[PDB]
Design a protein around this nucleic acid. Structure first.
Lengths: 54, 77
RNA sequence: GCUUGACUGCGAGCGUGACGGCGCGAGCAGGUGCGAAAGCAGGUCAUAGUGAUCCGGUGGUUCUGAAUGGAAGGGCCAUC
RNA sequence: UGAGCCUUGAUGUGUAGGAUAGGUGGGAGGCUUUGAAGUGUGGACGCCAGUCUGCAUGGAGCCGACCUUGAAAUACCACCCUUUAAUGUUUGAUGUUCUAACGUUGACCCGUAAUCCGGGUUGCGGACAGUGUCUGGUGGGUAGUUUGACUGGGGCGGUCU
RNA sequence: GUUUAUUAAAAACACAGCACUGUGCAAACACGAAAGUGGACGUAUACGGUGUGACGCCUGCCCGGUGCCGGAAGGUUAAUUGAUGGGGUUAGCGCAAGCGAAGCUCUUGAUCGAAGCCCCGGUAAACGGCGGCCGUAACUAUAACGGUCCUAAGGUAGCGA
RNA sequence: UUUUGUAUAAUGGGUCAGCGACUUAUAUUCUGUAGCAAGGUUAACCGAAUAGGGGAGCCGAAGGGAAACCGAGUCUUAACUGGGCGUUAAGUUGCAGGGUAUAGACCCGAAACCCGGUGAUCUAGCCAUGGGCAGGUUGAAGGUUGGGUAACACUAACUGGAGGACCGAACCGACUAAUGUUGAAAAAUUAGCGGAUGACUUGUGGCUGGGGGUGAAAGGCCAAUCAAACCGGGAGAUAGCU
RNA sequence: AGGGUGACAGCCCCGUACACAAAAAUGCACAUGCUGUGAGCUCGAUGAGUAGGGCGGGACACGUGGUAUCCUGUCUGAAUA
RNA sequence: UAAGGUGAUAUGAACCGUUAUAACCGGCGAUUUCCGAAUGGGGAAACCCAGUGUGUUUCGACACACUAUCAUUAACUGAAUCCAUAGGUUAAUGAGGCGAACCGGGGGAACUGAAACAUCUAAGUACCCCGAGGAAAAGAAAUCAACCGAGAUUCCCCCAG
């Protein structure tokens, strides 16, 4: 779903963009194995500050 | 028991209404599945026998929010 | 030969049925057909040719319209 | 790679006719020296009519009511249609890969002086299997029931308006 | 041997054997909503269902019907997908008769759509079936034989009051 | 009593005494009685408690029409010489009774369905652990030796003791016949008869439960029974039947 | 009121109306103390896998019927005075 | 409160007591064997068998005390796997069972009625199961009303068959 990436994962990733992917690829691979974070409307404002400040 | 641990979905009974509307008793079983959830807070795989609809409830609320509610009503995970 | 009375709304009175119902019926109102006219015609010489009801379909009618204005549905009449 | 979708470019033989004219719009000039017409080939479309275009020769132009056509310019620019091609997004009967769900009545380790169960590691399957919901076929396995009446007893035959 | 305790002890049931079908193990199957157990702590020389009932000679013909196993070009067809068209409501327009946008809603159900059926080929130690009408050998009768009946095919062996 | 019809040899009763069957509640209609009267009457409730208070509401004096609506007229139709239905009669509330409706509904009584419990001390199968099978026969395989053969085969004694083997007690089973039939016994006695080293029999204990069990299969068995056990409950099931 | 006393008792007895009584335990009332709880004003904030919908049912007198509302086994999914 | 009394069938025996220590009635306590939620382990209920701590002019045996399970809280420890968790131990507090109706919730019939019978009715009744109280449940409007308003829930009587 609306998950935001953090890693060099293959061609849907650009070090973090909101994509439209299925929920099966969301959980257990992106929801924690690393490499991403769920977007439960709290991380879309927290990691947005990580984009601007860094 | 076939009970959804999160949303509390328990099986209910109904009728098999055919073309002649003859009533025959049966039951409605939930789409229950045993899914393994990793939490970022406690660093542990949490296994939960939940419904397929209940997995979507976890997706909006968060696994830390769901397991906080199971601690309140005395559920064991 | 000429035509549509196998008319519409009615119907005094009567026959026959336990009942549901069925059958006959002059005449009146409206508008017609035939005849020059008096008149006759609401199917066929008569007696069999039929399916009660529930449920719907079609056409017509603001009759109803669960706040109001419509509408849906229902009823009425015609009909399957 | 098939299909929808969004840009970008090809793309239009009624006929007289400078001539394989898409329609509405802006439009008397844009383009060329940020190096042009017109010849010479390769590839290619195709009603072999002709057009498009890379490379290259080339070394200074091509147009517009121009008179005609029912309707004027490949002078140029716009939203597009017909046809057609290539990238880019979305969605799909078969084949492969990945592991991270899931499966493990495989090994191994621990709770644990435990053939249960639970956790971990690893091998192998794998988004199948299996289950739930919905749905078609099958279904006396099982359950609820019907299977008419007069009648010289009943059944049979026959009858019911 | 077993069986209708308490009217039927058998020609019945069982039986080793035989054949078909199911089944590669987390077996099929069965009890179980499920877990689990049985099968089995067994692995096709095994297990389950069914049929027949030692042994001896053997078990013919027929795949249409009814079942099952397949092969599939097409037809039809469920959930789902919701393409078109119609209706209701009314902003606005028409001095009126009426028409009618968007929105929402009702109704209609093209396409996508697997098994099954239609279709074709097998299977009878599957359920079954192995004839109806005629003609023909001394008198009848019978039919070795020969036609018809388009129903898939018309009693082989042995036996027979 | 039931019948067209019973002394009827159709049914019921040995007798005696006690007990025992058309009720009750709420509605509705009618009759009688009583009150008031174009009005009658309250229910819940209040209460110095059946009063008193409470008129919420019901019924009736107006109906016709599907209805809007109209109205002593209305409806039908374009309109009726008319017609369908009404107007011109006083009802209402108590009480008792005759009926109906719903409840078990005059009483007695089914065979059965369903639910919840209880039973495998009987019987059926199975598991676990023990016990019993007197006696008399038949003499397989194998072992051994001899004859015989080129060598096997074959055969002869001895030895061996195989068997859902035979005869037959205890034990188990119950085929024929009699007695017994208000028995000694809700299936036995007596005399014959079958099995009896097994697919045996039995003690002890456990497991399998009602649409289920078990079943060498009779639709048998499952506490003197089984085409669905027993007990309790729905339940006073229902009964057009006696 | 009633019951008993040798047959039917106002005046025989137990009682009755009435007047009283609790050391100890205990129910219920207020009065009051203590330990926790929390007032009022002002400024905000307004309950999301939820409402709804596809489907399968059930409950509302109301059997899917033109059928609203309520509940949910399944799938999907908002708006923000 | 008392001059009588030692419950009754049911006498007798033996005394007690008569002005406050007979008996009788009431309040508060003590003892309260064994079984039963039964709770130290078990068991065919009213029986058997331990662990630890404590007491002996006889420190054998007996007497005394305590030790069930679950959940919560807290402390101490503790794997695979380093930290961590799973797990283990101890302590504190609470629950267990019975009991006639009534309540709430989860499951849920059939006879019968329809003169048969499947929709339906019987009926969410009978029964089962969980949980709780003296009541429970419900309860302060995303409710009705209809352009006037009313203002939670529950019960009764009407509306009304």
């Amino acid at each position: 779903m609306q998950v935001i990436l953090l890693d060099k994962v293959a061609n849907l990733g650009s070090l973090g963009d909101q994509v439209n992917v299925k929920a099966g690829y969301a959980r257990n691979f992106l929801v924690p194995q690393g490499k991403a974070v769920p977007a439960t409307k709290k991380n879309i404002e927290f990691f947005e500050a990580r984009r601007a400040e860094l | 028991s076939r009970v959804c641990q999160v949303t509390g979905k328990r099986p209910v009974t109904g009728n098999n209404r055919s073309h002649a509307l003859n009533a025959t008793k049966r039951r409605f079983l939930p789409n229950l599945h045993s899914h393994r959830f990793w939490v970022e807070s406690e660093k542990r795989f949490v296994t939960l026998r939940v419904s397929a609809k209940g997995m979507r409830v976890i997706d909006k609320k968060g696994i830390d929010t769901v397991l906080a509610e199971l601690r309140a009503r005395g559920e064991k995970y």
